[PDB]
Design a protein around this ligand. Structure first.
Ligand code: CLA
Ligand code: CLA
Ligand code: CLA
Ligand code: CLA
Ligand code: CLA
Ligand code: CLA
Ligand code: CLA
Ligand code: CLA
Ligand code: LMG
Ligand code: BCR
Ligand code: SF4
Ligand code: SF4
Ligand code: SF4
Lengths: 107, 80, 67, 35, 143, 734, 41, 165
């Protein structure tokens, strides 16, 4: 209730270091309005080590998805009948994409 | 209605007539081109001035020219 | 007939037509018609016009040498 | 010389209502005048 | 062609419901256009005035308020099924005018029977300046 | 079909659409495109139209005089020209409420009145009008003059009174008469009226038509004029402690060279202006009999035009063939006249505020601001009109076979070079001005304003130091007594002019700083860019590479279609219509600069403008936001002050700006399809399909859409800036 | 390699390389010469 | 002392602006402990501000009535008052660099046209050729005026694409 959320820090180069305002808590930066601090507080994140681990896991999953795109286009390309299974797509999305993720976040 | 004028630089490629959406142009026999065809406008009163014939002309500048003026019911594309 | 009604095929020409897109430009002669049409000189140009075409028919009096 | 005090009460409604109305009436009859 | 065909109002219309972009009051005040074709079988086509209709096996008659709609339907039928249709223009008094196949061979052909009109015999760009034709009522391209 | 409304266009008559109305109004006075029109009939219509415009102008100024006399406070303003505000016209609006009626009662009036900002009060006080009866008789005389001019136009329109073609084409006699009579003896009579009336009226002596031919303007009595002792007129000028309304500190002088301003009223001396107009009249008369009339002496226009050709092919054929080009093409004369008149009113705007000619005009801040803004906007409009009618000349009436090898053929030959150089200088000015402004804004944003680039305008400061301003220092002319410019005229006009130019209170050669330098370069960018657009429209009017046959399509045609990549906005009319936007931006820049500099001068905070015009945050906040506080508070739930009408017309101008955006962004196809759907809706409805339209409703033309969007844009621009300027200058001053 | 080099030889890639080069040069100049305005050796 | 302006060192508003900036930097600095990274950052900012204010003084810069330095653009006047380094030398340097850019672009345009499909070379740049022309542009004015002398810099009006009149 007294320290403004700040997560972007600038480099002192041409006088833009004045953008690093006194947000409180012995820190200088830009007051962020994304609400990421409140999201991390709602997720139980306490230390910066958990944020580091989440960032590394996000980079790993991003590389995995990028390789997955390369694989599912160049190596193993699904056919037209695979995409046209709208019933299977809807069932897997309702049960797995939305419901399973909801249960995992609930847990 | 509008004025459609066709000059002697036309090669008789019949692209302007195919591009015409109101059947204004026609092909007449000629001797000034290799294809022995010349564009004509016997139905210029039905032309609206859409300039679709000018897009299909392959020659430099334009072998067919549309000049707007004195719009009528047919020239304004009105269904009412 | 005698010689040819136009320039040598494959030779560069300069277009003297003022209303053409390729005025004062160098093009290549593809073929010259011998029947007696108004514009027998078929010229292909390296740079296309706004319509995207690169060939045009010109008469005998609107072509010269590349200077 | 000096206009009377009721002149703003008469000329302003005349040139704000009556004169534009008769002008639009004349113009409407002139636009649709046919042969 | 050799003989100009005469339209028949008793020819069956293609199977269709109700059109909203159909004939307006201009149809009963000014001229309206009527397209006829000869379908060898029943099939579904797309009208330019709305959705889709089904043509009947035989003669088919349709009505429109614009000549552009008639030629759009004609070129759609020619490109999709090679139908070769023809449309007339009917005025308020009942005068019928033959419009698309003027010589019956379509304007893409020549037929050696059409006289070319409105053809300037000079090159474009050789027209006179508007100062040359002033207070005369003649445009530089009309000479 | 074939209605009778477009009688000047048979083709437009056979148009069963609403566009026939619109094209029946925009092409109303384009007589060259009318059917069956001869040159003589065109000249007669032009003469009748000119007489009509003169009659309308005289009726308008008669109405201004009458509405100042009746429902005005001219006498009260004459008694006290400092405190009480002038009244333009009374307000009779039945939609007004009682607080609105009470709030608009200003200047000691019995009803709601509008505070006059046209400045006719100062002008009519300067020329000698004092009583309301004089204004009444002047208004009725001008109404009689307007009626006489209208009847004269009607009679010259009538048969057996129409002038001949050679009468209109007699350029030499018209030039000689309008140089000698329209300018010479008109100015001579005006300065005679000045000497007879205004100087005695400014010296407390009433001179009227009743006592005319009885009071001598100078006590000598015209004998120094015949004796050649013209210096006796400049013997006893008015003193510094002279009252304009009374005879205190008066004198006996009608023509002098007392350069400077009257200390009491901060305006130019009446004797100085009388001497100026007398010298102007003499110069016009002595130059008004130079051209070759039917007498054996004079100058032929064609002979001087053809003889002035540089040798060795400097200009090719030279200036030959221009006489027939000017005489045959009326659009060339129209462009020349509009350009000269635009330069004239630009000079008028730039010289009124620095040298106020009317008594008690500099104190009236709102009046001066409104006059400068009006004159600058009119100047830009007829600048653009000159260029547009020059493009019309190039399209309609221009024969290259006639003027072959002349200056016109040469500038048409290398038009690409001119357009390219103007485009380069526009890019140069815009790039560097925007870079400087953004650099200054970023530097001031970072909390360290000393890093900003402030290029000192040393050229204008050097000029002003060379013309008497000793603030900048230096040792050029008119600042050092050893200079010949200082020695010459040391006892003629220098002591008054130096005192007027060394004072910081008046607007005579104000202090120019780096912010003034930057905004001056912005003005130069705007002028050069508008010039680039207009000369590209005029030079490429009759042909281009995308459209070689642009002459055959007329001046105002929409496009050539989507072929060749797209050809929309290719006519010279479209170039003019874009140049209208650029002219509006340029005049907005010059008026923003004038208004902010003068407002900071009147408030005394010139340092605020000096340190705030450098960066655009200062322009947005200290000018467009700080000075708009009184404007927006014209009406509110708390109440209403006298600036309610200005706030209302400010919002009105923003609304018309938005409607201009409507008519400029969206184009014809969507509205045409929507109109078709509305036509079906009206056709297929009960209880409403009984009625019908005589003409088919259609969407407006693309050229028509551009014109309507331009008109809405310019109307919103003018109304918004007029509202802001008057509310900011009058809400805190008087 | 040569296909990837010709991809790097395309106009956006070399423009990006020029952008980083010029931006880094100007930034390092501003950093090691803090806020200059007038050339004074 | 030109244009009625005072030097920055002799001016009072310049020192007042410097004092105000130092005061607000110290006010921002006093909210942090000395053993914190924002304290060192603000100390570095204050040192940079002091160095910039010292360098702007004793360098010929002058300010008028607001403490903000002014620049003299007229050559000669800047030469006789040591103000040439303000804009005169930088404008010459920018002209040198702009001529470098123009000469390099002209060399690449000319040298990539005598081959099949010059548009392909325009869209896919010859990187070794571009770098070679980059390192060969150090003598741009000499080559430019020599091309002007031999007439290859400018094209004649007969081979130039021209719009109809
Ligand atoms: C003493 C030697 C001398 C000099 C210096 C001149 C010089 C001149 N004479 Mg000349 N004259 C001479 C001897 C001389 N003459 C002799 C011996 C005779 C025989 C009696 C004449 C007879 C003569 C006639 C009859 C006329 C001249 C004219 C002229 C002027 C135009 C020349 C020309 O072709 O344009 C210069 C060459 C050009 C190609 C013009 C280029 C113009 C460029 C394109 C414009 C650039 C504008 C640019 C945007 C400006 C940027 C500035 C920015 C702030 C806007 C020029 C000032 C003409 C005149 O009065 O004009 C003032 C004219 O009518 N002269
Ligand atoms: C305020 C808005 C605005 C601005 C900035 C411009 C800017 C420009 N218009 Mg204008 N114009 C506008 C509104 C505007 N227009 C409107 C509303 C109209 C009416 C339709 C016109 C009508 C008009 C005409 C008719 C003409 C112009 C022309 C020009 C150019 C003038 C040359 C100049 O000053 O140097 C350039 C100055 C600028 C401010 C341009 C912006 C460049 C800055 C520096 C950004 C550059 C990129 C930057 C490095 C960032 C890179 C990253 C980023 C891309 C993501 C320039 C591109 C003329 C033209 O084309 O020049 C030959 C011209 O003939 N305009
Ligand atoms: C229950 C099983 C399941 C799950 C969880 C998903 C999940 C997803 N599918 Mg998929 N789908 C499935 C079955 C499933 N699918 C089936 C059976 C079919 C065939 C009928 C499809 C056909 C299909 C198409 C055609 C498309 C998708 C797309 C997507 C993505 C939607 C975007 C989104 O919400 O981001 C959510 C993102 C995350 C939660 C981040 C983590 C994502 C992880 C890596 C995915 C893990 C689940 C995966 C399916 C496990 C099997 C893969 C395994 C072999 C490694 C999402 C990742 C879209 C896509 O391509 O996105 C890439 C798309 O266009 N799906
Ligand atoms: C996805 C969401 C989720 C997850 C992950 C968990 C997980 C957990 N909860 Mg939670 N819970 C959830 C939802 C969830 N719950 C919900 C929705 C509710 C409803 C209110 C609860 C209510 C709840 C309560 C009230 C309690 C828990 C407890 C627990 C723990 C007991 C696990 C257990 O016995 O389950 C069953 C788990 C298994 C059968 C194990 C799975 C089988 C394994 C993985 C097979 C591995 C085989 C493999 C091949 C061999 C190893 C490989 C190796 C050799 C390499 C566990 C940490 C309890 C706790 O914390 O105490 C310990 C506890 O008190 N939870
Ligand atoms: C000396 C002054 C003068 C003269 C004699 C002319 C005369 C002419 N001009 Mg020119 N013109 C002038 C000044 C002048 N103009 C100026 C100052 C400009 C710049 C704005 C133009 C711009 C211009 C263009 C661009 C064109 C002409 C055209 C014409 C011709 C058409 C006039 C006519 O009969 O139609 C009468 C025309 C009208 C009645 C339309 C006027 C509509 C106006 C804009 C509405 C007023 C705005 C606003 C809604 C008012 C209400 C405000 C609101 C707050 C209440 C005629 C030869 C046209 C031409 O030659 O045709 C090819 C043409 O294309 N002129
Ligand atoms: C010395 C004699 C004389 C005088 C005083 C005038 C005065 C005038 N003439 Mg001119 N005129 C004259 C002789 C004269 N004429 C002769 C001899 C001819 C024939 C060759 C003409 C042919 C002529 C034409 C063709 C026109 C005029 C017009 C005008 C008016 C211009 C508007 C004005 O006052 O500008 C005010 C200027 C300032 C305040 C400065 C003005 C009333 C115009 C008109 O009808 O009125 C607009 C017009 O179109 N005159
Ligand atoms: C056209 C643009 C322009 C303008 C308006 C000025 C204006 C000025 N210059 Mg400059 N000058 C310019 C370009 C310009 N200069 C160029 C391009 C050079 C060559 C590099 C010079 C070289 C120059 C010198 C050498 C001197 C001036 C001086 C002056 C001043 C007085 C000039 C005079 O005649 O007395 C004045 C501030 C003089 C000065 O400083 O005042 C005494 C002076 O000594 N100027
Ligand atoms: C290096 C190539 C090159 C060269 C030598 C020129 C030269 C010229 N141009 Mg052109 N220009 C260019 C590229 C070039 N231009 C490009 C890419 C554009 C598109 C943005 C333009 C757009 C343009 C306009 C709109 C105008 C000019 C004008 C001019 C003239 C004025 C000089 C100037 O600085 O204008 C200013 C030029 C610019 C601001 C364009 C700079 C574009 C970038 C920043 C430079 C690109 C450099 C290039 C990557 C180098 C390649 C090297 C190779 C090894 C990779 C001059 C004839 C003006 C004119 O007509 O004057 C008579 C004018 O109005 N040019
Ligand atoms: C088989 C095998 O081991 O392949 C191992 C693969 C490919 O390995 C080789 O690759 C060559 C091309 O580089 C050729 O295709 C060879 O035939 C292939 O064997 O090596 C990798 O590193 C896998 C790809 C990693 C990147 C995936 C990005 C996909 C797009 C996401 C965005
Ligand atoms: C000193 C100075 C100044 C001044 C200046 C001046 C005054 C200038 C002028 C100038 C001029 C008066 C110019 C002219 C010109 C002309 C021409 C005609 C040109 C041309 C050019 C060219 C052609 C170029 C080219 C190029 C390019 C672009 C690229 C490549 C390279 C080259 C270089 C080759 C000032 C104050 C501002 C600022 C400071 C300094
Ligand atoms: S498109 Fe042009 S060249 Fe082809 S037939 Fe028509 S007018 Fe002739
Ligand atoms: S403008 Fe359209 S309707 Fe008219 S002749 Fe050309 S293609 Fe046909
Ligand atoms: S003005 Fe309209 S119809 Fe003409 S080219 Fe442009 S978008 Fe197309």
């Amino acid at each position: 209730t007294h320290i403004k959320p700040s997560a972007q820090v600038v480099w002192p180069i041409v006088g833009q270091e004045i953008l690093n305002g006194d947000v409180g808590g012995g820190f200088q930066g830009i007051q962020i309005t994304s609400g990421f601090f409140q999201l991390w507080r709602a997720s139980g994140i306490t230390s910066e080590l958990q944020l580091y681990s989440t960032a590394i896991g996000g980079l790993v999953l991003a590389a995995a998805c990028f390789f997955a795109g390369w694989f599912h286009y160049h190596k193993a390309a699904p056919k037209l009948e695979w995409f046209q299974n709208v019933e299977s797509m809807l069932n897997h999305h309702l049960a797995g994409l939305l419901g399973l993720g909801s249960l995992a976040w609930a847990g | 209605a509008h004025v459609v004028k066709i000059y002697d630089t036309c090669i008789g490629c019949t692209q302007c007539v195919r591009a015409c959406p109101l059947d204004v142009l026609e092909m007449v026999p000629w001797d000034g081109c290799k294809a022995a065809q010349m564009a004509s406008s016997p139905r210029t009163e039905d032309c609206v001035g859409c300039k679709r014939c000018e897009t299909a002309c392959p020659t430099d500048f334009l072998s067919v020219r549309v000049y707007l003026g004195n719009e009528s019911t047919r020239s304004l594309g009105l269904a009412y | 007939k005698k010689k040819e009604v136009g320039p040598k095929r494959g030779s560069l020409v300069k277009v003297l037509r003022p209303e053409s897109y390729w005025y004062n430009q160098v093009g290549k002669v593809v073929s010259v018609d011998q029947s007696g049409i108004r514009y027998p000189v078929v010229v292909r140009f390296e740079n296309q016009n706004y319509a995207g075409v690169s060939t045009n028919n010109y008469a005998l009096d609107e072509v010269t040498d590349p200077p | 010389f000096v206009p009377p005090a009721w002149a703003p009460s008469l000329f302003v409604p005349l040139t704000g209502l009556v004169l534009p109305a008769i002008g639009m009436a004349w113009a409407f009859t002139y636009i649709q005048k046919e042969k | 062609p050799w003989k100009q065909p005469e339209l028949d109002p008793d020819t069956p219309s293609p199977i269709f419901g109700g059109s909203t972009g159909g004939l307006l009051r201009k149809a009963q005040v000014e001229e309206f256009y009527v397209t006829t074709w000869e379908s060898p079988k029943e099939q579904i086509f797309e009208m330019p005035t709305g959705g889709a209709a089904i043509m009947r096996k035989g003669p088919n008659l349709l009505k429109f308020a614009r000549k552009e709609q008639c030629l759009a339907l004609t070129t759609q039928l020619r490109t999709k099924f090679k139908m070769t249709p023809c449309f007339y223009r009917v005025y308020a008094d009942g005068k019928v005018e033959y419009l698309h196949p003027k010589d019956g061979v379509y304007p893409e052909k020549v037929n050696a029977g059409r006289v070319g009109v409105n053809q300037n015999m000079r090159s474009i760009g050789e027209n006179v300046d508007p100062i040359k034709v002033k207070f005369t009522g003649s445009q530089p391209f009309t000479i | 079909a074939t209605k009778l409304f477009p009688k000047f266009s048979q083709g437009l008559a056979q148009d069963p659409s609403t566009r026939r109305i619109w094209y029946g109004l925009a092409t109303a006075h384009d007589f060259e495109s009318h059917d069956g029109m001869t040159e003589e009939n065109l000249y007669q219509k032009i003469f009748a139209s000119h007489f009509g415009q003169l009659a309308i102008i005289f009726l308008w100024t008669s109405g201004n005089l009458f509405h100042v006399a009746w429902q005005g406070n001219f006498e009260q303003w004459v008694t006290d020209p400092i405190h009480v505000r002038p009244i333009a016209h009374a307000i009779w609006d039945p939609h007004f409420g009682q607080p609105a009626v009470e709030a608009f009662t200003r200047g000691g009036a019995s009803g709601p009145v509008n505070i006059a900002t046209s400045g006719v009060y100062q002008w009519w006080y300067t020329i000698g009008l004092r009583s309301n009866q004089e204004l009444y008789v002047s208004s009725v005389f001008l109404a009689l003059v307007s009626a006489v001019f209208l009847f004269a136009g009607w009679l010259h329109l009538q048969p057996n009174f129409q002038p001949s073609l050679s009468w209109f084409k007699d350029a030499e006699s018209r030039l000689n008469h309008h140089l000698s009579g329209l300018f010479g003896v008109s100015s001579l009579a005006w300065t005679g009226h000045l000497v007879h009336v205004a100087i005695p009226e400014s010296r407390g002596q009433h001179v009227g038509w009743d006592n005319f031919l009885s009071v001598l303007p100078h006590p000598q009595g015209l004998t120094p004029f015949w004796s050649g002792n013209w210096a006796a007129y400049a013997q006893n000028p008015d003193t510094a402690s002279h009252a304009f309304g009374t005879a205190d500190g008066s004198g006996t002088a009608i023509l002098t060279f007392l350069g400077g301003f009257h200390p009491q009223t901060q305006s130019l001396w009446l004797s100085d202006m009388a001497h100026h107009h007398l010298a102007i009249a003499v110069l016009f008369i002595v130059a008004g009999h130079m051209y070759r009339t039917n007498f054996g002496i004079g100058h032929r226009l064609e002979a001087i035009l053809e003889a002035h050709t540089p040798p060795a092919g400097g200009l090719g054929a030279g200036h030959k063939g221009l006489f027939h080009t000017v005489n045959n093409s009326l659009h060339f004369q129209l462009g020349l006249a509009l350009a000269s008149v635009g330069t004239i009113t630009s000079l008028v705007a730039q010289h009124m505020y620095s040298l106020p000619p009317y008594a008690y005009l500099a104190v009236d801040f709102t009046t001066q601001a409104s006059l400068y803004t009006h004159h600058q906007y009119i100047a830009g409009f007829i600048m653009c009109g000159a260029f547009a009618h020059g493009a019309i000349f190039f399209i309609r009436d221009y024969d290259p076979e006639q003027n072959k090898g002349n200056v016109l053929a040469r500038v048409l030959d290398h038009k690409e070079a001119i357009i390219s150089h103007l485009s380069w200088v526009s890019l140069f000015l815009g790039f560097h001005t925007l870079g400087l402004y953004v650099h200054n804004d970023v530097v001031q944003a970072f909390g360290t304003p000393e890093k900003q680039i402030l290029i000192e305008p040393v050229f204008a400061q050097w000029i002003q130091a060379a013309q008497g301003k000793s603030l900048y220092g230096f040792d050029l002319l008119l600042a050092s007594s050893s200079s010949s410019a200082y020695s010459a005229g040391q006892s003629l006009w220098l002591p008054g002019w130096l005192e007027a130019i060394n004072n910081n209170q008046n607007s005579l050669f104000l202090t120019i700083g780096p912010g003034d330098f930057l905004v001056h370069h912005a003005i130069a960018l705007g002028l050069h860019t508008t010039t680039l657009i207009l000369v590209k429209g005029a030079l490429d009017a009759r042909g281009s590479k995308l459209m070689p046959d642009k002459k055959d399509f007329g001046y105002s045609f929409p496009c050539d279609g989507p072929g060749r990549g797209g050809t929309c906005d290719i006519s010279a009319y479209d170039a003019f219509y874009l140049a209208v936007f650029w002219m509006l931006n340029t005049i907005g820049w010059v008026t923003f600069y004038w208004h902010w500099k003068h407002l900071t001068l009147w408030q005394g905070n010139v340092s605020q403008f000096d340190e705030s015009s450098t960066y655009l945050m200062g322009w947005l906040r200290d000018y467009l936001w700080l000075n708009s506080s009184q404007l927006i508070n014209g009406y509110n739930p708390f109440g209403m002050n006298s600036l309610s009408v200005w706030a209302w017309t400010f919002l009105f101008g923003h609304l018309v700006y938005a409607t201009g955006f409507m008519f400029l962004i969206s184009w014809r196809g969507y509205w045409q399809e929507l109109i078709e759907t509305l036509v079906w809706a009206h056709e297929k409805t009960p209880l409403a399909n009984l009625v019908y339209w005589k003409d088919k409703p259609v969407a407006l033309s693309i050229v028509q859409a551009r014109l309507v969007g331009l008109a809405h844009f310019s109307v919103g621009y003018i109304f918004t800036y007029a509202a802001f300027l008057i509310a900011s200058t009058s809400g805190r001053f008087g | 390699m040569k296909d990837f080099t010709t991809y790097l030889s395309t106009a956006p890639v070399v423009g990006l390389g020029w952008a980083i080069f010029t931006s880094g040069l100007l930034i390092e100049i501003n950093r090691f010469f803090p806020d200059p305005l007038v050339f004074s050796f | 002392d030109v244009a009625g302006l005072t030097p920055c060192s002799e001016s009072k508003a310049y020192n007042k602006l410097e004092r105000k900036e130092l005061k607000t930097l110290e006010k921002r600095l006093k909210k942090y402990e000395p053993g914190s990274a924002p304290y060192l950052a603000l100390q570095a900012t204050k040192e940079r501000t002091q160095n910039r204010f010292k360098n702007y003084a004793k360098a010929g810069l002058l300010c008028g009535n607001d403490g903000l330095p002014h620049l003299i653009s007229d050559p000669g006047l800047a030469l006789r008052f040591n103000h040439a380094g303000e804009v005169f030398i930088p404008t010459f340097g920018f002209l040198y660099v702009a001529g470098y850019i123009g000469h390099v672009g002209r060399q690449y345009i000319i040298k990539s046209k005598e081959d099949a499909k010059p548009t392909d070379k325009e869209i896919i740049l010859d990187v070794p050729l571009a770098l070679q022309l980059a390192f060969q542009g150090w003598a741009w004015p000499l080559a430019a005026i020599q091309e002007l002398r031999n007439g290859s810099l400018l094209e004649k009006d007969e081979n130039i694409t021209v719009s109809p009149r």
